[PDB]
Amino acid sequence: ELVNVVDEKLGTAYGEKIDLNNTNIAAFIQYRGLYPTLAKLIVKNAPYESVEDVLNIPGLTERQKQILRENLEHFTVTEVETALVEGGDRYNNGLYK
Amino acid sequence: EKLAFYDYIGNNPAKGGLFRTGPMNKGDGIAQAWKGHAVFRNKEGEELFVRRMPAFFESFPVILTDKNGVVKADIPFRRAESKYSFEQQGVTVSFYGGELNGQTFTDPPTVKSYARKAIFGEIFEFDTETLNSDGIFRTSPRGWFTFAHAVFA
Amino acid sequence: EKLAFYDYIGNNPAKGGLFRTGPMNKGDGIAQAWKGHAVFRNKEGEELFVR
Amino acid sequence: QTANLWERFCDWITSTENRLYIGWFGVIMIPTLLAATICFVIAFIAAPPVDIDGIREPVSGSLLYGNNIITAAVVPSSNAIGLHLYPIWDAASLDEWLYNGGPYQLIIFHFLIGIFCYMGREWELSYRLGMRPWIPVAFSAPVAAATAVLLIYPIGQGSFSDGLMLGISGTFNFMIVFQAEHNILMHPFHMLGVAGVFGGALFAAMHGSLVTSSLIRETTETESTNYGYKFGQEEETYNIVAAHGYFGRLIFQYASFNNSRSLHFFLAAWPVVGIWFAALGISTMAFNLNGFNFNHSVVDAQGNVINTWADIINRANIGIEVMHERNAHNFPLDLA
Amino acid sequence: MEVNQLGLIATALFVLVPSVFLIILYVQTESQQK
Amino acid sequence: TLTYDDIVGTGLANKCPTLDDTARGAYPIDSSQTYRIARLCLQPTTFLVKEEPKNKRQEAEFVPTKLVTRETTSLDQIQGELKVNSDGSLTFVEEDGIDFQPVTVQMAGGERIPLLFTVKNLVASTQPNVTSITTSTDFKGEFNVPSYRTANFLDPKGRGLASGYDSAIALPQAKEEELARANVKRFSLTKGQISLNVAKVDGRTGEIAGTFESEQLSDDDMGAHEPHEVKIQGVFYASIEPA
Amino acid sequence: DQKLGANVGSAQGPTGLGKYLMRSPTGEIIFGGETMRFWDFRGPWLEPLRGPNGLDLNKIKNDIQPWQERRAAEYMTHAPLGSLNSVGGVATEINSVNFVSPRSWLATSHFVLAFFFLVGHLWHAGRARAAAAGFEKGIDRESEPVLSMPSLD
Amino acid sequence: SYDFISQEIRAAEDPEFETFYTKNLLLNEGIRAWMAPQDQPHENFVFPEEVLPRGNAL
Amino acid sequence: LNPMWRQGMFVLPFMARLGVTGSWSGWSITGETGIDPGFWSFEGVALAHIV
Amino acid sequence: METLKITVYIVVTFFVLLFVFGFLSGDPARNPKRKDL
Amino acid sequence: AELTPEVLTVPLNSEGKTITLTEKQYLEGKRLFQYACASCHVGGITKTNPSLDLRTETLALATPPRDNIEGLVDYMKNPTTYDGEQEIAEVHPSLRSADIFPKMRNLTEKDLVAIAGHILVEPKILGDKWGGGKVYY
Amino acid sequence: METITYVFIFACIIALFFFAIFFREPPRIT
Ligand code: CLA
Ligand code: CLA
Ligand code: CLA
Ligand code: CLA
Ligand code: HEC
Ligand SMILES: CCCCCCCCCCCCO[C@@H]1O[C@H](CO)[C@@H](O[C@H]2O[C@H](CO)[C@@H](O)[C@H](O)[C@H]2O)[C@H](O)[C@H]1O
Ligand SMILES: CCCCCCCS[C@@H]1O[C@H](CO)[C@@H](O)[C@H](O)[C@H]1O
Ligand SMILES: CCCCCCCS[C@@H]1O[C@H](CO)[C@@H](O)[C@H](O)[C@H]1O
Ligand SMILES: CCCCCCCS[C@@H]1O[C@H](CO)[C@@H](O)[C@H](O)[C@H]1O
Ligand SMILES: CCCCCCCS[C@@H]1O[C@H](CO)[C@@H](O)[C@H](O)[C@H]1O
Ligand SMILES: CCCCCCCS[C@@H]1O[C@H](CO)[C@@H](O)[C@H](O)[C@H]1O
Ligand SMILES: CCCCCCCS[C@@H]1O[C@H](CO)[C@@H](O)[C@H](O)[C@H]1O
Ligand code: OEX
Ligand SMILES: [Cl-]
Ligand SMILES: [Cl-]
Predict the structure, then answer these.
(1) Coil/strand/helix, residue D73
(2) CA A82 to CA F186: how far, in whole Å?
(3) What is the C-alpha to C-alpha distance for residues K76 and K92, in angstroms, rounded to an integer?
(4) Is F173 found in the same domain as F86?
(5) Nearest Cα to H2, choosing from H30, H25, H36?
(6) Whether residues F51 and F164 fall in one domain
(7) Lumenal side of the membrane: what ranges (chain B)?
(8) F touches which chains (3+ CB pairs under 8 A)?
(9) Residues 6 or more apart whose Cβ sits within 8 Å of residue B142
């Protein structure tokens, strides 16, 4: 049958946390120290098999790795959804204020 | 059943259109049976109430509040910043009385479908085939009488 | 398919009605495809022909 | 002789005996209005959908493509064209020209030339007839208004895709978007426009009723009173002193016209000036000098906004703004 | 388009009945002695 | 060299660079060096759409179409890694660029076929043992064809995937199952195939040009109808650089 | 968005056209969105990014200077939109910014003036013709031209 | 005179069908959703941001 | 399988009989695509009769 | 398209020339009163 | 409702020290904010980057914290990205870049304190309408 | 059938224009 895949995602951890594989980059403003520098690196280096794989992004500084560890509790990963990552939508999803 | 049917906006005479002609049955259909009273709950088990459509509105959003009027769920338009979706809030619907008495639905599209009917009040099953009904509300003879006699006056 | 379609009585102009109005497609339908040639046989295997 | 044959032509062109006056303005008016009318009729009936907003989202305007009289329109040329002139011969094919809204440009440019020449033609025949010359000054008011919505507003906004759409529902779309983007209801020139058309209708009914009220008895009880006037009779057909005696008592004496020339000048001037201002409203909101903005103008002692009816208007304007051309904006401000 | 099936007869009679009324009155005026 | 004001409005901006008839050389490949395509340009000259016949037994044909969206069709400023593989073949891995164009073409009779002409995420490889790129070199590869509209796009009744209504709000009490395909938007992701036939090589400058043929599906209107098969033919230009 | 990591050349917008960059009808690379209509614009802060094919993606990726970012932000936020009481911004803007562009003041005033001067031309041109011919005060009752013309029918 | 039923049947089934009539209904839906909470205060409307109909960006 | 005579066409065969076989929209009654009929397409014939 | 363009240019030029030479042909004298204009 | 000293009392630093603004201070801050900032920050939003607003809760999660007078005054001298990693005076008005943002050229320490106090007081009056955008108009 | 109806009414109106202008009751001075 036909299903809206975005509504379906809202029932996964994507609807509860920042999904490192799908969520638009503005969501990283919700927590201290993640935007824009780490947020860019995270979206650029996605997808991730598990949240803690975010710690392995090449070139991270030692403080950045600590900042990421403080925020892993706010991250999740789900399977990449084409509708959320095409169109450059992770960088600008057409929503402002 | 007759009491539940009065508590349904498809019988409200201020829901019609000047050129939507004929019987009310031509719009929502020939009513067959009450489905029963839908009780919506979130995943914590709190009962939620669908905000009903006022007669002024041809269309209306789907918003669910607790008994104190605090918004607890809705059907979002933009999804990217949704906080209250039925999927996030685990909204379910259970029916008491009527055809669906004793049944509970958890599939979000199905729960949302019933929530869309609940903005109209009590939920009915309709025969939409016999008259090839188009799903658009019409007024009753109360409405047509009033119109003709105010205009003629 | 065009040759088989001519060998079909729904295209015969002497099969109509004075008040059966409109295109031929309104009667038997809009032709889509030839089903193929039907060969009928009995249990002995003799080929039989529909009158 | 060339000079004689040419003078015979000039005499026929300017002849006061043609059933419809031609004239030199008519030499331009007739071909341009015919081209615009023929293209409009064909397009209104049969044109395929047009990508008005340049986002490959074609809007169906014609009857044959699923419209009725109320919803059909000839759709403006594409936003991708902007203000570029898009004649048929610049298209790779008629198919391309139709997709991109070519018919709209052909129609509106021939129409505008045609109505400007119609206006000059009103001057011209009045000159041939020995009349006074200012009937085209009255007609300049509707001409100015048509020019505002078909030419000036798209120039100011940079695209014929924002000009008046040539249909009944298309007109309402233009009006509603305009209200969100300029708050035209709060612009004093539109207010003057409304006074012009409300007042013009009022004064038409007033003048019509006062003359009708004082017709001199010239007919029997059977026949229409219209037979009491004969075309070209020398005497006036109503008692203007009776009419003035009624109206001066209805309000007060000095509020009423007893001079028929003053009265009829006023009847001309009120709607004409009102529509001049209406047209100037559109033509200056074309450059985004917009209606009054009293959004959050009233503030309490602490600094809370106390809403006024202006703020309720603003909420409706926002609802229009966020919904219109729902796939066309990628960035947060609608700057044209 | 799925239009109302009575729209055609409604429009036809809306045009025809009053137009015919006027044509009747006009022609019988013309035929009166002048 | 032409400037913008030499070019503007002529249609030349939608045309890929060309090479002279003298460009029949060979660009040497050093298997120890890394390479990139600094610029890849793809200029369609023909759009063909495969007919969808009723019999479904006869072989459907690709037929000509009429472009209605003007000189807006070319892909350009595309770049990516040009890998040298163990067998001497080359593999181009597309990474960035103006690598899509919406295009609408019209069939005989008027049916409009929108498509997302694209080589997004192209990976295309030559034959083995390309010690030099020559006019005998060919590239063959596959690319992604995402939905022609992206997830925010709203239909004329305001329905969409990542935004919009989820029902036909103008028919409030209609039965919904019959409208499911129009109400529930779906985001297509399919594969396309492309071949690049190198016809010219400037061995000195690292520039190549030739013809291409690509095959891909057209717009399915976010799941509302079946897409059509499209064949795109045109010319290409590419500039190769050590990296 | 490019600073955040977007590949602005390959970013497909909701319609299928580029969200940031697209082609004009003759192929030049231009800014996307509704500003596709304004691709004839030229200004000194933008031309360094333009090449023979239009906007140059390499220059966009590598060569935008801070003074260009400054100028674009300044000009975006001083767009010539504003109310008659000089509230800057779109018509839905709240009060705060006291701004109407000089370009809007000068364009509107001179359209108003040019329009009435065309009306004055018509007025005085028609009157000058009628006065030169000797009927600017009205029709001579004893010599009315139309009375000497054949009827039209 | 709110709707044309034939237009709504076609548009509901055909997401490529668009007229100025359907365009104006979208504007109406915007007016209703964005003006009703302040214009009808006795209703105590609370429309969370996510349910408000709106196009891209704006 | 759906020629003009299955579709109730009455004047179309008379245009075709004398050589008008293509539409301005690009099709021909023998099933061709991308043909240019010139002015004397079915539509041009109709227009000429109206004028 | 090129033939259409030339045709329209000629047509436009023709009517515009009629207008200009027409109004140059002693138009002030084409009135019912003083014709010595 | 009234603009009281309590409403005008705002955090001076992250350590919990407060300052009570005068009514004259707040009004000066409002005027200077219109003069130098409202073209982009009208109503508490940010027109050229809507992802970052002027809500107190947003300022509290910036690095270094910007939800206090000293944080906001420091920002107006030497602005950074939201994570503090990058100095952005070349594209954001500040005392450090008053050469290219001339409306900053005459601002005193007192002026910056006033602007900072306006930014902290305004959500105490307007609530979620500050930084809310058109949804809250 | 609805397009035919709309175009038919329009065509009748244009015909009426023609008769109203060229076959009017001639205005006559008496
Ligand atoms: C007091 C008058 C009146 C009222 C209130 C009703 C009420 C009703 N009728 Mg009944 N009916 C009536 C008189 C009335 N009828 C008359 C006189 C007849 C004989 C024709 C009928 C024959 C009839 C039938 C056959 C049917 C009904 C049906 C119905 C029901 C559906 C109504 C509907 O769709 O209308 C629709 C209303 C409109 C579309 C409005 C029309 C507006 C007009 C066209 C405006 C005209 C404007 C004018 C031209 C302007 C002039 C301008 C000029 C001055 C310048 C409703 C209970 C239906 C039903 O369900 O039966 C079981 C049904 O099938 N009625
Ligand atoms: C020689 C004339 C002629 C012929 C052979 C055709 C043939 C055709 N027409 Mg065309 N048509 C014609 C003229 C003709 N038409 C005219 C003049 C018009 C304008 C009205 C049309 C408008 C038209 C339309 C709109 C359509 C057709 C269609 C068709 C096709 C189906 C025909 C059908 O169903 O008929 C049915 C015929 C009858 C039911 C017979 C009627 C007999 C009358 C009523 C008897 C009257 C008796 C009289 C009152 C008694 C008097 C007694 C007194 C003397 C005492 C067929 C190919 C259809 C088609 O398929 O198009 C693609 C279609 O939709 N035609
Ligand atoms: C009065 C006659 C007249 C006029 C003024 C126009 C005007 C126009 N036509 Mg139309 N046309 C006409 C009759 C006319 N048409 C007729 C009879 C037909 C059927 C054959 C057409 C068929 C037609 C088509 C199919 C198209 C046009 C188009 C156009 C537009 C572009 C024309 C152009 O590029 O000229 C070329 C420019 C010149 C030839 C230079 C001008 C020559 C004069 C001598 C110079 C002076 C001009 C200057 C403004 C001074 C004016 C002086 C003033 C006192 C009169 C323009 C609005 C196109 C369109 O609408 O695009 C959207 C288009 O596609 N026309
Ligand atoms: C070309 C004419 C023109 C233009 C474009 C401007 C533009 C400007 N003026 Mg200047 N000014 C002008 C002439 C002009 N002015 C004249 C003639 C005077 C002497 C009165 C002034 C004296 C003046 C002062 C003292 C000030 C300005 C200011 C300004 C700025 C704010 C404008 C404002 O708020 O208007 C408000 C808009 C109105 C009052 C609307 C007037 C609408 C009129 C009445 C419509 C008239 C229509 C037409 C002319 C009459 C037709 C009648 C019909 C029957 C024929 C703006 C840049 C202000 C500024 O910011 O300076 C730094 C300021 O303080 N102007
Ligand atoms: C546009 C040209 C602006 C003007 C004028 C002012 N600001 Fe701004 N501001 C602007 C942007 C694009 C940003 C985000 C920058 C980034 O990349 O991080 C900001 C940010 C701020 C902040 C931080 C907000 C936060 O949530 O952390 C503050 C406190 C701020 N701006 C204040 C401010 C003041 C006081 C201004 C006038 C003196 C001012 N800004 C002007 C854009 C623009
Ligand atoms: C900015 C571009 C400038 C380009 C150069 C413009 C040059 C203009 C030259 C104007 C030449 C005028 O040419 C003019 O034409 C017509 C031709 O019958 C004449 O007009 C004549 O018409 C009829 C006779 O047929 C007489 O009733 C009328 O009184 C008489 O004037 C003028 O007497 C002649 O002088
Ligand atoms: C299998 C496809 C899954 C969906 C992937 C969507 C984003 S793929 C996208 O492709 C672009 C080049 O076209 C690059 O610019 C960008 O870095 C990359 O993320
Ligand atoms: C996908 C369908 C979910 C099943 C229950 C839907 C809500 S109830 C449903 O509502 C319809 C009108 O919308 C009526 O026609 C129908 O009789 C009724 O069963
Ligand atoms: C005399 C007026 C002629 C009007 C010509 C209309 C365009 S021609 C028209 O175009 C349609 C869509 O492309 C085709 O389906 C149809 O077969 C064709 O006749
Ligand atoms: C009334 C509109 C006239 C439009 C004229 C278009 C001419 S089109 C012209 O017509 C010829 C007809 O035989 C063709 O042979 C020729 O190839 C074609 O280009
Ligand atoms: C009353 C004005 C209507 C004019 C219509 C003229 C169509 S003209 C027609 O156009 C076709 C476009 O593909 C060409 O195939 C053909 O060669 C050309 O003659
Ligand atoms: C030197 C002792 C450390 C504490 C006093 C100096 C830092 S104080 C500090 O000032 C910052 C802006 O500069 C703000 O981010 C912060 O909220 C404020 O508390
Ligand atoms: O196009 Mn028609 O509308 Ca004048 O704003 Mn911008 O652009 Mn579109 O949006 Mn809003
Ligand atoms: Cl719109
Ligand atoms: Cl935009």
Answers:
(1) strand
(2) 11
(3) 9
(4) no
(5) H25
(6) no
(7) 1-144
(8) A, B, C, D, G, H, I
(9) B13
